[PDB]
Design a protein around this ligand. Structure first.
Ligand SMILES: CN1CCN(Cc2cn(CC(=O)N3CCOCC3)c3cc(NC(=S)NCCc4c[nH]c5ccccc45)ccc23)CC1
Length: 124
């Protein structure tokens, strides 16, 4: 409710602890395979951040999968940048990664990140 006491730092603190759990492989429940690379994560965080992962895990036919093989055309560094963003709220857009990050974000259906990439290319 809008009447309750607001903890303005709570959401970021929760996400920080979720990233800490990922760094220790605690309760991770899926491995994301991107070409020769593998990334372990929590399905709930992937679903919350990505329309692709939401559509995958919300379907009862795929919810229980422990391995997800992404399109092998996806660049592993671009995916790692977006996975870090999911868990940190910080997006590492550089001149050398912007195109890979953007195309990956389109594939992952993260529109907010896609729109932000469109401003990075514009502001360059
Ligand atoms: C106009 N739409 C165009 C297509 N977009 C796909 C999409 C993009 N994201 C990432 C995203 O928007 N954000 C913004 C906030 O910061 C994190 C990343 C998504 C995340 C989820 N995950 C969950 S749990 N959604 C629960 C509600 C829900 C969404 N669709 C539903 C369908 C059926 C039932 C419920 C829902 C699902 C879909 C997307 C959505 C908007």
């Amino acid at each position: 409710a809008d009447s309750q006491i607001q903890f303005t730092r709570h959401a970021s603190d929760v996400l920080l602890n979720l990233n800490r759990l990922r760094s220790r492989d605690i309760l991770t429940d899926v491995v994301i395979v991107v070409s020769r690379e593998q990334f372990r994560a929590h399905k709930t965080v992937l679903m919350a951040c990505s329309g692709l992962f939401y559509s995958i895990f919300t379907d009862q036919l795929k919810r229980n999968l422990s391995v997800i093989n992404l399109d092998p055309e996806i660049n592993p560094e671009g995916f790692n940048i977006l996975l870090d963003f999911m868990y940190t709220s910080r997006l590492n857009l550089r001149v050398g990664n912007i195109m890979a990050v953007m195309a990956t974000a389109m594939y992952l259906q993260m529109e907010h990140v896609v729109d932000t990439c469109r401003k990075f290319i514009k502001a360059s």
